């Protein structure tokens, strides 16, 4: 149906994906149990670490652009991955070495993340009718590979230790990295320019010079949030006054701004979300016993299950609208699973989170699969930087809500922790609804800017 | 996911015996363990446990006689029974779940081991 390149992008793209959530599902747990951080501090460094990660993806697509080229940027971020990983499971002879790991995982994906996308973009002839469906299917590739490493990594670590899950990561990047290499000749002719110059080494060493740099800084600031909020405040607050220096752009900032409600929701699911569920859910669903760390994997699995369905089936600030009541509804659930359908011994039902999942997950669908595509519409460079340092942003102000389920080492009781989590959801869900319902209220204004 | 309970037996009142819960693939150290007991007649009830991070829990009528505690090296989990009493006689299970809380219910907990009859004598030697 597609473009024989269009096969290679998908499992390069499914297999990084795999290693990135393979990390990202144990990586709170990790550092509570192995390295013996609080819930809170490791709610915290969970937000630096998706912080970086993120709001470093602008500099993959300038290197990719300009200096080395799409596809040899490709290879290099995979290869910084998959180092990354590897460098993560030896942490746990090393401990010390952890935050360097991570620093290079966020490097890494910073190299990589543009890259795949840009080139599935030039596989097309520029009005092909199959580039809607070929994203809807780069999306899916996503969330297949999240929704696997999602699923069994928790598995993975509790039977056989973190060493051998984070392995398996940089496994899942070398398996990128060979189909890449074995389906090169389909993307001879795709590229960005520099991909058809031969290579510049005074620009390769910049690059790599300036990578190992950052992965210095990343480690720092992961290992110092105090200051990584500060860095990202002082950040945000200038390039808001050089923004509001320099009105169609008006409805790309305040679609920003509700984005970046959106990306605060998304970071419970890995950590308060997440305890959540070991704490006050029942680990047990149709029968069968599973790993509450792997009730991750129900946002992947509503996407890829939905997608398909939403693709099939107002305009911009209305899409926006749903999906911010949709994340509102999947809060609202929570609270409401612990307030009223509890056991007696504090425990909810898991069809309740499965249910929250679900809410969360079409949000997502409407805001975020479905941002930067008419943020595109409305502009560029520059927003497109914006667009994933304020998603780094919502990542360190997720975290830091997140601290406010936390629950210290000794408590062992769930009608202890139930009303924390209720608290602390029921309040997100009232706000966000009010969030939802002042984005309502702008659609109008918003849909004639666009005009 | 499958643990082996040992260490019961028959004792005199006042006495000691020592459970052990192992676990066949999984790491323990994941995992809430509590101990339960069902006595002739009786509903299993939650006697004593440990969450995966030192936290510990126990019954009113235990306290002061039991202590539970683990050993993350052994990956192996410990009721110490002291003090023993004729109406701690009972089938002792222990059992597991992930994370760090301890439900008082057998249902908050999905993995179980077989039992391990303990039974304390009225038996005093003779003045
Ligand atoms: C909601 C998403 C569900 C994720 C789907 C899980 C993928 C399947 C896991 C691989 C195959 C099953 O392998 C195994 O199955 C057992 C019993 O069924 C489950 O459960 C076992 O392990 C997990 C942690 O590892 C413990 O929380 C659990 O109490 C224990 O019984 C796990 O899921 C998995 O260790
Ligand atoms: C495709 C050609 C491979 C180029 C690899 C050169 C690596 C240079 C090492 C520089 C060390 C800092
Ligand atoms: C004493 C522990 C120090 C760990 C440093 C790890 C560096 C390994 C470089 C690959
Ligand atoms: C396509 C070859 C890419 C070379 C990048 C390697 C830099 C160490
Ligand atoms: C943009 C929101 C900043 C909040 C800092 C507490």
Redesign the interface.
């Given at each position: 149906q597609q473009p024989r390149p269009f096969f290679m992008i998908f499992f390069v793209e499914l297999w990084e994906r795999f290693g990135y959530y393979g990390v990202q599902g144990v990586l709170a747990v990790f550092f509570?149990?192995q390295l013996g951080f609080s819930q809170e501090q490791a709610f915290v460094t969970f937000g630096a670490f998706a912080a970086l990660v993120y709001g470093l993806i602008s500099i993959g697509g300038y290197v990719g652009d300009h200096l080395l080229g799409t596809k040899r940027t490709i290879v290099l971020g995979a290869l910084v991955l998959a180092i990354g990983y590897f460098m993560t499971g030896m942490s746990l002879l090393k401990p010390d070495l952890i935050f360097i790991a991570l620093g290079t995982i966020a490097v890494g994906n910073g190299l990589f993340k543009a890259n795949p996308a840009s080139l599935l973009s030039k596989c097309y002839p520029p009005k092909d009718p199959r580039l809607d469906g070929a994203f809807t299917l780069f999306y899916m590739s996503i969330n297949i590979g999240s929704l696997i490493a999602l699923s069994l990594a928790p598995v993975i670590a509790?039977?056989f230790?973190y060493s051998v899950t984070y392995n398996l990561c940089g496994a899942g990047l070398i398996i990128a990295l060979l189909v890449y290499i074995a389906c090169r000749g389909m993307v001879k002719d795709i590229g960005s320019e520099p991909d058809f110059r031969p290579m510049s080494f005074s620009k390769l060493l910049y690059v790599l010079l300036g990578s190992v740099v950052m992965i210095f800084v990343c480690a720092w600031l992961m290992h110092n949030v105090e200051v990584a909020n500060l860095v990202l405040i002082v950040l945000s607050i200038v390039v808001t006054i050089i923004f509001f220096r320099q009105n169609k752009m008006f409805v790309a900032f305040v679609l920003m701004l509700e984005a970046v409600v959106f990306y605060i929701l998304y970071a419970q699911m890995p950590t308060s979300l997440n305890?959540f569920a070991?704490?006050?859910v029942?680990?047990?669903i149709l029968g069968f016993?599973i790993?509450?760390?792997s009730f991750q994997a129900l946002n992947p699995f509503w996407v890829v299950l939905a997608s398909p369905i939403l693709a099939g089936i107002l305009s911009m600030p209305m899409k926006f609208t749903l999906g911010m009541f949709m994340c509102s509804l999947g809060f609202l659930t929570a609270a409401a699973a612990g307030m009223w359908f509890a056991?007696?011994?504090?425990?909810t039902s898991p069809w309740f989170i499965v249910l929250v999942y679900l809410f969360q997950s079409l949000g997502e669908l409407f805001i975020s699969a479905l941002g930067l595509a008419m943020i595109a519409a409305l502009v560029m460079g520059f927003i497109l930087g914006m667009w994933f340092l304020t998603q780094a942003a919502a990542f360190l102000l997720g975290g830091y809500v997140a601290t406010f389920t936390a629950?210290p080492?000794?408590?062992?009781?769930?009608l202890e922790?139930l009303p924390v989590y209720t608290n602390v959801f029921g309040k997100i869900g009232l706000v966000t609804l009010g969030v939802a319902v002042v984005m309502l209220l702008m659609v109008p204004w918003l849909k004639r800017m666009i005009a | 996911?499958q643990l082996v309970e040992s260490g019961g037996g028959l004792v005199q009142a006042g006495g000691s015996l020592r459970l052990s819960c192992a676990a066949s693939?999984?790491?323990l150290?994941?995992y809430?363990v509590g101990w339960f007991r069902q006595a002739p007649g009786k509903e299993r009830e939650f006697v004593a446990?440990i969450?995966?991070?030192?936290?510990?829990?126990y019954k009113d009528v235990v306290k002061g006689r039991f202590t539970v505690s683990r050993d993350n090296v052994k990956d192996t989990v410990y009721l110490q029974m002291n003090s023993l009493k004729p109406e701690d006689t009972a089938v002792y299970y222990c059992a597991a779940?992930?994370?760090?809380?301890?439900?008082?219910?057998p249902?908050?907990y999905?993995?179980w081991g077989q039992g391990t009859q303990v039974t304390v004598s009225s038996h005093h030697h003779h003045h």
């Open positions: 509570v149990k509790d039977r230790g305890f070991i704490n006050n029942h680990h047990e016993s790993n509450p760390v056991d007696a011994q504090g425990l629950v080492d000794n408590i062992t009781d769930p922790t | 996911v693939g999984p790491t150290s994941n809430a446990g969450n995966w991070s030192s936290g510990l829990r779940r992930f994370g760090g809380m301890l439900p008082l219910q249902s908050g999905a993995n």
